[PDB]
Ligand SMILES: *[C@@H]1O[C@H](CO)[C@@H](O[C@@H]2O[C@H](CO)[C@@H](O[C@@H]3O[C@H](CO[C@H]4O[C@H](CO)[C@@H](O)[C@H](O)[C@@H]4O)[C@@H](O)[C@H](O[C@H]4O[C@H](CO)[C@@H](O)[C@H](O)[C@@H]4O)[C@@H]3O)[C@H](O)[C@H]2NC(C)=O)[C@H](O)[C@H]1NC(C)=O
Ligand SMILES: *[C@@H]1O[C@H](CO)[C@@H](O[C@@H]2O[C@H](CO)[C@@H](O[C@@H]3O[C@H](CO[C@H]4O[C@H](CO)[C@@H](O)[C@H](O)[C@@H]4O)[C@@H](O)[C@H](O[C@H]4O[C@H](CO)[C@@H](O)[C@H](O)[C@@H]4O)[C@@H]3O)[C@H](O)[C@H]2NC(C)=O)[C@H](O)[C@H]1NC(C)=O
Ligand SMILES: *[C@@H]1O[C@H](CO)[C@@H](O[C@@H]2O[C@H](CO)[C@@H](O[C@@H]3O[C@H](CO)[C@@H](O)[C@H](O)[C@@H]3O)[C@H](O)[C@H]2NC(C)=O)[C@H](O)[C@H]1NC(C)=O
C-alpha cells in the first residue's frame with residue numbers, strides 16, 4: 084500500500100522552493116530509494132502553499148488535506164499558523180509533527196503534536212551554563228523578536244540567585260539597522276552579548292559591528308540560534324574575537340556528513356543571494372529538523388503496519404481510528420538522525436533531551452569546544468595549554484589608539500622641516516618605545532594626544548578621572 | 549471550549565453563514581488568533597476584549613482591541629516606579645506571556661538606574677510560599693506582581709501568612 | 715531572652731494582682747516595663763496595637779485568657795504585627811489550644827507555658843477520651859481555637875476529683 088504524509092510550506096512567489104520544503108521532498112525520496120528503512124510502504128508527499136502568517140488558510144489547506152487523507156501533517160513553520168493546525172489535528176486524531184518552536188501556552192489540552200525543535204526550557208539553561216562557565220557578571224541579552232523573552236526565560240530571570248547585572252535591549256523594526264543599538268553598547272561598556280536572533284540577522288548584525296570597530300578582543304558573543312556554523316566567519320577569523328554558540332546539526336559522523344554533502348549538490352539549483360555574511364549551500368537547522376521529521380514518523384509506521392489513510396472530514400468530528408496508537412509510537416521513538424538523539428519527552432510532545440555541541444570562533448574557523456546534555460551539564464574540553472610560543476607577531480593585523488602627552492624627554496614634537504603628519508609628528512623616548520614594541524608585537528599604532536592636558540586624578544566631588 | 553482553536557473556527561463559520569455583522573470573539577490567544585484570521589479573510593469586523601500577543605508579521609487589518617495596550621501600561625508602571633524613587637524591584641509574573649506583557653519595564657535597566665530581579669510563580673496556586681520565602685530572604689521590599697485579580701488575591705493570602713504584609 | 719523592655723498587656727483589673735512579681739521586677743533588675751491594658755471590648759484592640767507599633771513595642775507579655783489570646787492575634791495579624799521582629803509571651807496555660815496555622819509561617823516566635831502532661835500516653839488517652847462527649851457540641855470556627863483539646867480549666871477539675879479521691 085501507500086502512505087500519504089502531508090505537509091505545509093510557505094512558497095516564495097517565483098522563488099523556487101522553500102529550504103524546509105526541499106528537505107521534506109528529498110527525505111521522502113531517501114526512504115523510497117533505500118529499502119532498508121520501510122521496504123514496503125512507499126511514502127507520498129502532499130505539499131501545499133501557505134501565506135506568511137495566515138491562520139485561516141492554514142486551517143483551510145489542512146481541512147482540504149485531511150479530505151485527501153494523510154497519516155501526519157508536518158507543521159506550518161510559523162507560530163500563529165501552527166496553533167491553528169495543531170487544533171485541527173487534535174480534533175480529528177491525526178498527529179501534527181512540528182519543526183520549529185511556537186509559543187506553547189500552558190493550557191492547550193492537546194495530545195497530537197510533537198515538536199522537533201528543542202525546547203527553550205532546555206536551551207535557556209544551556210545559555211546560562213555557558214554564562215556560568217565564562218564567569219560573566221554583566222550579561223547584555225539582545226533579542227529581536229518579541230517572543231525572544233520566552234526563549235530566554237531562565238536567563239531573563241537569575242539575576243536573583245546567580246548574581247548577574249543583566250541589561251536587556253531590542254533590535255528595532257528597521258531590521259538591518261543595529262547601528263543605533265550598537266552605539267549604545269560601545270558606550271556603557273557592553274562587551275558580553277547574548278544576541279538572540281536568526282542567523283540571517285546574526286550575519287548582518289556582525290557587519291554593522293565590524294564597521295563600528297566593535298569586533299576587537301574586548302568582546303564576547305553567545306549567539307543563541309542553532310545556525311552559527313552557517314556564517315562566513317572569514318572576516319572575523321583573524322580579529323581575536325571571542326564568539327561562542329551552539330550546534331545541534333551533527334557534522335561529525337561520516338554517515339550524516341554525506342547527507343549535507345549530497346543535498347548541497349541538490350539545492351545548488353536553488354540560487355544563492357549576494358554577500359549577506361552567510362555561507363552558501365548549508366542545510367541549516369530547519370531543513371535538518373524537517374529531515375528528522377520524516378524519519379521519526381517513519382520508524383513509527385514501521386512498527387505499526389496495519390495503517391490506512393481515512394479521508395476525514397472537518398465538519399464531522401469522527402477521529403482517525405489509528406490515531407491514539409500511532410501518536411504513542413511517535414512519542415516512544417529514538418531513531419537517530421542529523422540533529423543527534425531524537426528522543427521525546429512524555430507528558431508534552433517536546434524535545435527536552437538532546438545533544439548540543441558548543442562551538443567557538445578560533446583561528447581555524449568555528450570549532451567544537453565541548454558538549455552539553457540536559458542531565459549531564461556542560462562538558463567543556465581541556466585546552467590544557469600550549470605555550471606563549473613566539474609572542475613576536477601575536478598582535479598582528481591589529482590597530483591601536485595610543486594617547487600620550489608632550490614630555491620633553493619622553494614625547495616631543497619633531498622640530499624639523501615642512502609639516503610632519505601622522506606618527507612622524509612625534510619623537511622621544513616612549514615614542515621610541517613604541518617603535519620597538521611594534522617590532523616585537525607587530526601591530527599598528529596612531530599616537531593621539533589627550534584633549535584635557537592632564538595625566539589622571541580622581542575628581543574629589545564627582546569621582547571621575 | 550477555550551484552549552481549543554478549532555471549535556473557535558467552526559463556530560465562527562457558523563455565525564458567518566448565519567450572517568453576523570461583527571464577531572465579538574473569544575478571550576484566549578490560541579482561539580482569538582484563529583478568529584481574526586477568519587475575520588480578515590471574509591471582511592467582517594472582529595472586536596477583541598482581551599490582551600493578545602499580535603505577532604508583528606500578522607499583516608491584518610480587521611481587528612480592534614479594547615483591552616489597553618501593555619505598551620502603555622508598562623510605561624505607566626515605570627512612571628510609578630520612578631515616582632516612588634525605587635532602585636530595586638522584583639517582577640513576579642504569572643504565566644509565560646508576562647515577559648511579553650512587560651517588555652518596556654524589563655528593558656528599563658538599559659536606560660535608567662532601575663535594577664530588576666524577575667521571578668515567576670509556580671504552576672500551582674498555594675505554592676507561592678517557597679517563592680515568597682525566597683523573597684523575604686534577600687530583602688525584596690518592592691514587588692510588581694503581574695497576575696490576574698483571582699491570583700492577586702491568592703498571593704496576598706500567602707503574603708499575609710508569610711508575615712509579608714508590613 | 716535577654717530583654718530590656720517589655721509591655722505587659724493585661725486584660726481585666728486583677729491582672730495587676732496576678733503579675734506582682736513581674737511589675738516589682740524593675741526595682742531589682744534592668745527590666746523596664748511599660749504596662750498597658752486592653753479595652754472593655756474585644757475588637758477594639760487595634761487602637762491599642764497601633765499605639766504599640768508606634769513606640770516600637772517589640773516584646774509583649776499578653777496576660778489574657780485563651781479566648782482573648784486568639785482575639786488579639788487576629789487583630790495583631792491585621793495590624794501587620796505578626797513579623798519576625800515581634801515576640802509574644804502568653805501568660806495563659808492554654809497556649810497549646812490556639813489555631814497557629816495562619817501564624818506559623820509569619821516569623822513570629824510566640825512563647826508561653828503549658829502544664830498539661832501531653833507526653834505520657836496515660837495523659838494523652840484521657841484527653842482523647844474526653845473529646846468524644848465534647849465533640850457532641852459544635853464550636854464556632856471564627857474564634858481561632860483548635861477544637862478537641864482539653865483546656866486547663868477542664869484539666870484541673872479532672873485532677874481535683876482524683877486528688878480528693880486519693
Ligand atoms: C576570550 O577567550 C579567551 C581565551 O581564548 C579568554 O581568556 C581569559 O582571559 C582572562 C583575562 O582577560 C583570564 O582571566 C583569569 O582571571 C582569574 C581571576 O583572578 C584574577 O582577577 C583579578 C581581577 O579581577 C586580578 O587582578 C588577579 O590577578 C586575580 O588573579 C584568574 O584566576 C586567572 O589567572 C589564571 O592564570 C594564572 C597565570 O596567568 C594562573 O595562576 C592560573 O592559571 C589562573 O587560573 C586569569 O587572570 C582567563 O584565564 C583567560 N582564559 C583562558 C586563557 O582560557 C577570555 O575570557 C574570553 N573572553 C573575553 C571577553 O576576552
Ligand atoms: C592576520 O594575520 C594572520 C597571521 O597572524 C594571517 O592569517 C593566516 O595565518 C595562517 C597561519 O598563521 C596562514 O596559514 C597557512 O597558509 C599556508 C598557505 O598560505 C596561504 O596561501 C594563499 C595566499 O597565497 C591563501 O589563499 C591560502 O588560504 C593560505 O592561507 C598553508 O600551507 C598552511 O597550512 C598548513 O601549514 C602547516 C605546514 O603544513 C601546518 O602545520 C598547518 O597545520 C596548516 O595545516 C597555513 O594554513 C595563512 O597564510 C594566513 N593568511 C591568510 C589566510 O590570508 C592573515 O593573513 C592576517 N590577516 C589578513 C587580512 O591578511
Ligand atoms: C519533561 O519536561 C519537564 C518540564 O521541563 C522536565 O522537568 C524538568 O526537569 C529539569 C531537569 O531536566 C529540572 O530543571 C531544574 O532546574 C533547576 C535550575 O538549574 C535545578 O536546580 C534542578 O535541579 C533541575 O535541574 C526540573 O525538574 C523540570 N523543570 C521544570 C518542571 O520546569 C522533565 O525532566 C522532562 N522529562 C524528561 C527530560 O525525561
Ligand SMILES: *[C@@H]1O[C@H](CO)[C@@H](O[C@@H]2O[C@H](CO)[C@@H](O[C@@H]3O[C@H](CO)[C@@H](O)[C@H](O)[C@@H]3O)[C@H](O)[C@H]2NC(C)=O)[C@H](O)[C@H]1NC(C)=O
Pocket residue numbers: 462
Ligand atoms: C566529558 O568529556 C568526555 C567527552 O568526550 C567524556 O568521555 C571521556 O573522553 C576521554 C577522552 O579524552 C576518555 O579518556 C580516555 O578514553 C580512551 C578511549 O576510550 C580510554 O581508552 C582511556 O582509558 C581514557 O579513559 C574518557 O574515558 C571518557 N569518559 C568515559 C568514557 O566515561 C567524559 O566522560 C565526560 N564526562 C566527564 C565527567 O569527564
Ligand SMILES: *[C@@H]1O[C@H](CO)[C@@H](O[C@@H]2O[C@H](CO)[C@@H](O)[C@H](O)[C@H]2NC(C)=O)[C@H](O)[C@H]1NC(C)=O
Pocket residue numbers: 798799800801822823
Ligand atoms: C525567635 O526565633 C529566632 C530564630 O529561631 C531567634 O532569633 C535569632 O536566633 C538565635 C536563637 O535564639 C538567637 O541567639 C539570635 O541572636 C537571633 N537573631 C538575632 C538577629 O537576634 C529567637 O529565638 C527568636 N527571635 C525573635 C526576634 O523573636
Ligand SMILES: *[C@@H]1O[C@H](CO)[C@@H](O)[C@H](O)[C@H]1NC(C)=O
Pocket residue numbers: 117118119120
Ligand atoms: C539505508 O539507511 C540505513 C539507516 O540510516 C543505513 O544504515 C543504510 O546504510 C542505508 N542503505 C543504503 C543503501 O543507503
Ligand SMILES: *[C@@H]1O[C@H](CO)[C@@H](O)[C@H](O)[C@H]1NC(C)=O
Pocket residue numbers: 084122123388
Ligand atoms: C513488508 O515487506 C516484507 C519484505 O521485506 C514483506 O515480506 C511483507 O509482506 C511486507 N508487508 C506488507 C506488504 O504488508
Ligand SMILES: *[C@@H]1O[C@H](CO)[C@@H](O)[C@H](O)[C@H]1NC(C)=O
Pocket residue numbers: 473475
Ligand atoms: C620564532 O622567533 C624568532 C624571533 O625573531 C623568529 O625569527 C622565528 O622565525 C620564529 N619561529 C621559529 C620557528 O623559530
